[PDB]
C-alpha cells in the first residue's frame, strides 16, 4: 500500500491555535469526524482527527500559515461528492471544509457576473441567480451538495456543458489561498482581461493540490425564455448516433443538452427509485433539452426534428414536455442513475472520453468478458461531449473482477487515444493511471508546478499526480 509521508501530527497546541483562528469552527469529536472521513462511494475512509470550518478567506490564510510552519497536511473538502477519492484523507490530514464559506458577495444584474464564496452550494446558487433570471453555466446531479469551489477545483463538466462549455471559460476570477497562507487575488470579475498570465487557470482542475479556492467570480448565462425536453427510445446505438447528428442539424443553436442511457440504466432507476418509463421499452434512451429565446420557434424546430427522427426510424417512441414539473420528471431519469447504481451494489466506475462513434463498444465488450460475475454493466452519459460513464455493479467487490477490468479498460481507452478521466478528475483513485492519457514530460511539468506552489506538499498529499 501507500506509505504515510513524514508530516507532523496535530497537538493540543495546534487545536488551541485553530480555536483562536476560527472560534467555534473546530470539530474534534471522533463520531462527528466519521462522516467527513468517508468518501461519497463509501469505499475510502480517512483517519483525520480534526475538521476546521472557517467562515472567511483570512481564516483560511491563517490556518494554512500555521499548517505550513508546523508541517501539517491539509485535505480540502467541499460538498464531498467527488468520485475519485480526492475529497477525504488517506491518513490523518486535517479536513478543511468550506461548508461555512457560503456567502454571495455580489451579483450584477446586467453583466450576469456572480461573485461568491467557494462553499456556496450549486443548487442554492442556481436558486439565487434564477430568481434574477440568470442560470449557472453548469449543472450536475450533485447540485444539491457540491460546492462551487469543488466544481472549480475538479473542473466539473455536467449536463449543460454542451451549451455553455468549460469552467476554464466561464470562471472569470478566483481568490486562492496558497499552501504557505499567501492570498492570491486573481478575482477579476471582468469578461476580458489580458493583463499577464491567466494564473487562475492553474487552479481549475487542480483538485486542491496547488491552493484552496476561497472566492469565485463566474459568468452566469441568462435564463432561457423557453425550455423543452424530449425523451426518446432508440432501437440501437447507431440510431442514437444518427439521432444526435439529426438533432444538431435541425435544432442547432437552441440545443442545451444531449444525454443517453441504456436499457439497464432505465431498469435500475425504475427498480430502486420507482420511476416508471414514459416511453416504450427500448435498448437505448436519449434525453434532449433545448433552451431558447422564442418558444414558438423552438417548438417548430423540435416538431420538425421529431417528425423526421420518427420518420426515418431513428426513434421508435418519444415524449415531449414544457411543463416545469414534467421536465423535471424526465430529467430525474437521467440525473439519478448514479444513485441507483450505488444502491445496486458495489460499483466499479469509469469516466471516459472516447470517439463518439465508438462510445458504447466497451460496454458490449465488458458484458461479454465479464460473465455472471458482474451483477450489471451499464453505459450512459454526455454523448454530445464524447463522455461515457461506464459502471459495473456486483454484490461485493472482488479482486478477480478488478483484474478483468484493469488495466483492460485503460488499455482500450489508450488504444482509442481517449481520456481515462473525462470530468471526475484524478484524486486518490486514478493518480497512477495518468500515463494512458498524458505523456511523461507533461506529468513532469505538473510535478514542477506542485513543487513551486507547495514545496512542503501539505495540500492533499497522495493525490492527484503520479507517485
Ligand X SMILES: Cc1cc2nc3c(=O)[nH]c(=O)nc-3n(C[C@H](O)[C@H](O)[C@H](O)COP(=O)(O)OP(=O)(O)OC[C@H]3O[C@@H](n4cnc5c(N)ncnc54)[C@H](O)[C@@H]3O)c2cc1C
Positions in 422-441 near ligand AKG (CB under 6 A): 423
63: contact with a copy of itself by CB under 8 A: no
Question: Computed over its alpha carbons, how large is the radius of gyration of the chain?
Answer: 23
Reading the block at residue 133, the C-alpha cell is 433570471
Instruction: Identify which of 151, 150, 186 has the alpha carbon closest to the alpha carbon of residue 75.
Output: 150
Instruction: Identify which of 424, 274, 271 has the alpha carbon closest to the alpha carbon of residue 352.
Output: 424
In the complex with ligand X, the residue whose CB is nearer, 153 or 363, is 153
255-262 sheet: strands from edge to edge: 317-321, 226-234, 284-292, 255-262, 376-381, 387-394, 346-353
Q: Which does 149 bind (CB under 5 to 8 A by kind): ligand AKG, ligand X, a copy of itself, none?
A: ligand X
In the complex with ligand AKG, the residue whose CB is nearer, 68 or 424, is 424
51-52 sheet: strands from edge to edge: 26-27, 51-52, 94-97, 74-77
154: contact with ligand AKG by CB under 6 A: no
256: contact with ligand X by CB under 6 A: no
Q: Which does 25 bind (CB under 5 to 8 A by kind): ligand AKG, a copy of itself, ligand X, none?
A: none
Q: Which does 356 bind (CB under 5 to 8 A by kind): ligand X, a copy of itself, ligand AKG, none?
A: a copy of itself
424: contact with a copy of itself by CB under 8 A: yes
Smallest distance from a copy of itself to CB 453, Å: 8
Reading the block at residue 130, the C-alpha cell is 434564477
Smallest distance from ligand AKG to CB 442, Å: 24
Contacting residue, 25, 79, 224, 233, with ligand X by CB under 6 A:
79
Residues 93-122 that bind ligand X (CB under 6 A): 98, 118
Strands 346-353 and 376-381, bridge-based pairing = unpaired
Where are the extended beta strands (E) located within 158-283? Answer: 171-177, 183-186, 212-219, 226-234, 255-262
Smallest distance from a copy of itself to CB 254, Å: 6
461: contact with ligand X by CB under 6 A: no
171-177 sheet: strands from edge to edge: 104-107, 113-117, 212-219, 171-177, 183-186
Q: Which does 254 bind (CB under 5 to 8 A by kind): ligand X, ligand AKG, a copy of itself, none?
A: a copy of itself
User: Please, which residues have CB within 8 angstroms of residue 204's CB and are 6 or more apart in sequence?
Assistant: 152, 153, 155, 167, 168, 171, 174
The span of 23-31, 78-86, 127-135, 354-362 binding ligand X (CB under 6 A) equals 78-86
In the complex with ligand X, the residue whose CB is nearer, 142 or 266, is 142
| Continuous segment of H or E residues that includes residue 117 | strand 113-117
Peptide bond into 107 cis (omega under 30): no
In the complex with ligand AKG, the residue whose CB is nearer, 12 or 192, is 192
331 C-beta neighbours (distance < 10 Å), count: 20
Contacting residue, 37, 48, 117, 151, with ligand X by CB under 6 A:
151
419: contact with ligand X by CB under 6 A: no
Contacting residue, 69, 131, 281, 300, with a copy of itself by CB under 8 A:
300
Contacting residue, 17, 94, 186, 394, with a copy of itself by CB under 8 A:
186
Contact 98, 119 (CB under 8 A): yes
Q: How far is Cα 263 from Cα 256, in angstroms, rounded to an integer? A: 23
Q: Is 349 annotated as a binding residue?
A: yes
Q: Is 102 annotated as a binding residue?
A: no
Q: Is 338 annotated as a binding residue?
A: yes
Instruction: Identify which of 133, 126, 217, 97 has the alpha carbon closest to the alpha carbon of residue 167.
Output: 217
In the complex with ligand AKG, the residue whose CB is nearer, 54 or 381, is 381
What's the burial of 414, exposed, middle or buried (CB within 10 Å: 0-12/13-18/19+)?
A: middle
Instruction: Identify which of 39, 213, 150 has the alpha carbon closest to the alpha carbon of residue 425.
Output: 150
Point out which residues pair with 204 in neighbouring strands.
none
The span of 221-229, 280-288, 335-343, 428-436 binding ligand AKG (CB under 6 A) equals 335-343
381: contact with ligand AKG by CB under 6 A: yes
In the complex with ligand X, the residue whose CB is nearer, 309 or 337, is 337
Instruction: Identify which of 340, 386, 392, 342 has the alpha carbon closest to the alpha carbon of residue 368.
Output: 392
Q: How far is Cα 433 from Cα 410, in angstroms, rounded to an integer? A: 8
349: contact with ligand AKG by CB under 6 A: yes
Contacting residue, 127, 191, 271, 373, with a copy of itself by CB under 8 A:
191
Binding site for (R)-2-hydroxyglutarate: what residues are annotated? 334, 338, 349, 391, 424
Q: Which residues bind ligand X (CB under 6 A)?
A: 40, 75-83, 86-87, 98, 118, 140-142, 146-147, 149-151, 153-154, 156-159, 207-208, 212-213, 338-339, 423-424, 427, 460
Q: Which residues bind ligand AKG (CB under 6 A)?
A: 83, 141, 337-338, 341, 349, 351, 381, 389, 391, 423
Amino acid at each position: 500500500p501507500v506509505r504515510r509521508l513524514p508530516f507532523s501530527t496535530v497537538s493540543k497546541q495546534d487545536l488551541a491555535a485553530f480555536e483562536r483562528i476560527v472560534p467555534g469552527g473546530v470539530v474534534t469529536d471522533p463520531e462527528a469526524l466519521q462522516a467527513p472521513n468517508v468518501d461519497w462511494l463509501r469505499t475510502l475512509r480517512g483517519c483525520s482527527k480534526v475538521l476546521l470550518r472557517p467562515r472567511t478567506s483570512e481564516e483560511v490564510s491563517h490556518i494554512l500559515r500555521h499548517c505550513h510552519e508546523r508541517n501539517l497536511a491539509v485535505n480540502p473538502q467541499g460538498g464531498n461528492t467527488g468520485m475519485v477519492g480526492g475529497s477525504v484523507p488517506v491518513f490523518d490530514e486535517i479536513i478543511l471544509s468550506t461548508a461555512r464559506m457560503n456567502r454571495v458577495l455580489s451579483f450584477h444584474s446586467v453583466s450576469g457576473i456572480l461573485v461568491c464564496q467557494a462553499g456556496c452550494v450549486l443548487e442554492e446558487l442556481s436558486r439565487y441567480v434564477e430568481e434574477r433570471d440568470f442560470i449557472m453555466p453548469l449543472d450536475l446531479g450533485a447540485k444539491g451538495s457540491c460546492h462551487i469551489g469543488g466544481n472549480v477545483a475538479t473542473n466539473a463538466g455536467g449536463l449543460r456543458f454542451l451549451r455553455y462549455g468549460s469552467l476554464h471559460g466561464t470562471v472569470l476570477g478566483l481568490e486562492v489561498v496558497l499552501a504557505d497562507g499567501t492570498v492570491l487575488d486573481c478575482l477579476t470579475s471582468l469578461r476580458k482581461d489580458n493583463t499577464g498570465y491567466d494564473l487562475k487557470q492553474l487552479f481549475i482542475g487542480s483538485e486542491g493540490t496547488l491552493g484552496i479556492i476561497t472566492t469565485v467570480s463566474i459568468l452566469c448565462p441568462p435564463k432561457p425564455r423557453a425550455v423543452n425536453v424530449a425523451f426518446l427510445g432508440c432501437p440501437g446505438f447507431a440510431e442514437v448516433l444518427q439521432t444526435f447528428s439529426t438533432c444538431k442539424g435541425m435544432l442547432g443553436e437552441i440545443l442545451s443538452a444531449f444525454e443517453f442511457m441504456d436499457a439497464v440504466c432505465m431498469q435500475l432507476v425504475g427498480r430502486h427509485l420507482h420511476l416508471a418509463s414514459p416511453v416504450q421499452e427500448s435498448p437505448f434512451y436519449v434525453l434532449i433539452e433545448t433552451s431558447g429565446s422564442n418558444a414558438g420557434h423552438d417548438a417548430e424546430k423540435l416538431g420538425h426534428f421529431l417528425e423526421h427522427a420518427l420518420g426515418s426510424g431513428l426513434v421508435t417512441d418519444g415524449t415531449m414536455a414544457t411543463d416545469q414539473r414534467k421536465v423535471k420528471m424526465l430529467w430525474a431519469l437521467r440525473e439519478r442513475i448514479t444513485e441507483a447504481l450505488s444502491r445496486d451494489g458495489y460499483v466499479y466506475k469509469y469516466d471516459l472520453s472516447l470517439p463518439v462513434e465508438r462510445l458504447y463498444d466497451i460496454v458490449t465488450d465488458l458484458r461479454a468478458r465479464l460473465g455472471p460475475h458482474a451483477k450489471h454493466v451499464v453505459g450512459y452519459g454526455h454523448l454530445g461531449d464524447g463522455n461515457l460513464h461506464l459502471n459495473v455493479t456486483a454484490e461485493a467487490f472482488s479482486p478477480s473482477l478488478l483484474a478483468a477490468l484493469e488495466p483492460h479498460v485503460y488499455e482500450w481507452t489508450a488504444g482509442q487515444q481517449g481520456s481515462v478521466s473525462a470530468e471526475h478528475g484524478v484524486g486518490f483513485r486514478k493518480r497512477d493511471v495518468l500515463g494512458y492519457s498524458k505523456p511523461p514530460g507533461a506529468l513532469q511539468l505538473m510535478q514542477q508546478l506542485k513543487a513551486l506552489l507547495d514545496p512542503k506538499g501539505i495540500l492533499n498529499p497522495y493525490k492527484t499526480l503520479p507517485s
